[PDB]
Swiss-Prot record:
Annotated protein name in UniProt: Nuclear receptor subfamily 4immunitygroup A member 1
Segments for region (Binds lipopolysaccharide): 159-182
Post-translational modification: Acetylated by p300/CBP, acetylation increases stability. Deacetylated by HDAC1.
Entry function: Orphan nuclear receptor. Binds the NGFI-B response element (NBRE) 5'-AAAGGTCA-3'. Binds 9-cis-retinoic acid outside of its ligand-binding (NR LBD) domain. Participates in energy homeostasis by sequestrating the kinase STK11 in the nucleus, thereby attenuating cytoplasmic AMPK activation. Regulates the inflammatory response in macrophages by regulating metabolic adaptations during inflammation, including repressing the transcription of genes involved in the citric acid cycle (TCA). Inhibits NF-kappa-B signaling by binding to low-affinity NF-kappa-B binding sites, such as at the IL2 promoter.
Impact reported for residue 91 to A: Abolishes binding to activity regulator Cytosporone B
Subcellular location per the Swiss-Prot or TrEMBL entry: Nucleus; Cytoplasm, Cytosol; Mitochondrion
Subunit note: Binds the NGFI-B response element (NBRE) as a monomer. Binds the Nur response element (NurRE), consisting of two inverse NBRE-related octanucleotide repeats separated by 6 base-pairs, as a dimer. Interacts (via N-terminus) with NLRP3 (via LRR repeat domain); the interaction is direct, requires binding of NR4A1/Nur77 to NBRE-containing dsDNA and lipopolysaccharide, and leads to non-canonical NLRP3 inflammasome activation. Interacts with GADD45GIP1. Interacts with STK11. Interacts with IFI27.
Tissue expression summary: Fetal muscle and adult liver, brain and thyroid.
Record comment regarding domains: The NR LBD domain binds the lipid A moiety of lipopolysaccharide (LPS) in the cytosol.
Naturally occurring in which organism (per UniProt): Homo sapiens
Ranges of residues in domain NR LBD: 1-231
Region listing for AF-2, in residue ranges: 220-231
Induction remark: Induced by cytosporone B (Csn-B); directly stimulates its own expression. Induced by corticotropin-releasing hormone (CRH). Induced by growth-stimulating agents.
Gene for this chain: NR4A1
Length: 234
């Protein structure tokens, strides 16, 4: 509980690259020069897709998660995807240097991403800089990300079990944020204050996917497309 914290930490660390598996072979801080094209849209989608399988395997190692109904599992994963992608990217990346680090280990400069992502990448970097100012340690991050996934959503079959699991992870976080600050609220409410901002960023991502689907240079991969279509409240 305790052991929960440890499970969450192990699941986080196993879901991303070792600082020795960082791939800088494509990184270029300088770019030449300039609307988006097909290679930029394909990379955007590819980056998005590479998190799918990683985040699904990460969730299965959250104790309690595999014991939710299968329909609630998928609804949670699908509804939280964009926000988890953003949160983990922001935490992993190095915004002081314009460096995006993706879950494969691939390192890219902000300018190598701008054309695909549009403005959204700047907003993600702003968020990253703000997340970095909190100096969120790994166990606290391991809880936060899990709280992004395990949260109320319209259409849950067992909303109370999801809440129960959310409460356990919240307690685990609260306790950890005390046992390291010296107990007895501020840090914690500043941390939890990152979740609504993350929703707002999820929306900017939906706008970018909309726009790209409008322009129709390359189709989105079917699973991303489904997430986009299923998370539209209309």
């Amino acid at each position: 509980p305790a052991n929960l914290l440890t499970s969450l930490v192990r699941a986080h660390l196993d879901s991303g690259p070792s600082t020795a598996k960082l791939d800088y072979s494509k990184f270029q801080e300088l770019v030449l020069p300039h609307k988006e094209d097909a290679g930029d849209v394909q990379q955007f989608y590819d980056l998005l897709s590479g998190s799918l399988e990683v985040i699904r395997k990460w969730a299965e190692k959250i104790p309690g998660f595999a014991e939710l109904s299968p329909a609630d599992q998928d609804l949670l994963l699908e509804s939280a995807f964009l926000e988890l992608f953003i949160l983990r990217l922001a935490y992993r990346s190095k915004p002081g240097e314009g460096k995006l680090i993706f879950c494969s280990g691939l390192v890219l400069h902000r300018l190598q991403c701008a054309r695909g992502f549009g403005d959204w990448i700047d907003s993600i970097l702003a968020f990253s800089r703000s997340l970095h100012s909190l100096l969120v340690d790994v166990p606290a991050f391991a809880c936060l990300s899990a709280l992004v996934l395990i949260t109320d959503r319209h259409g849950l079959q067992e909303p109370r079990r999801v809440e129960e699991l959310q409460n356990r992870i919240a307690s685990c976080l609260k306790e950890h944020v005390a046992a390291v600050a010296g107990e007895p609220a501020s840090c914690l409410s500043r941390l939890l204050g990152k979740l609504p901002e993350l929703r707002t960023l999820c929306t900017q991502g939906l706008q970018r996917i909309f726009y790209l689907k409008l322009e129709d240079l390359v189709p989105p991969p079917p699973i991303i497309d489904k997430i986009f279509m299923d998370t539209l409240p209309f």
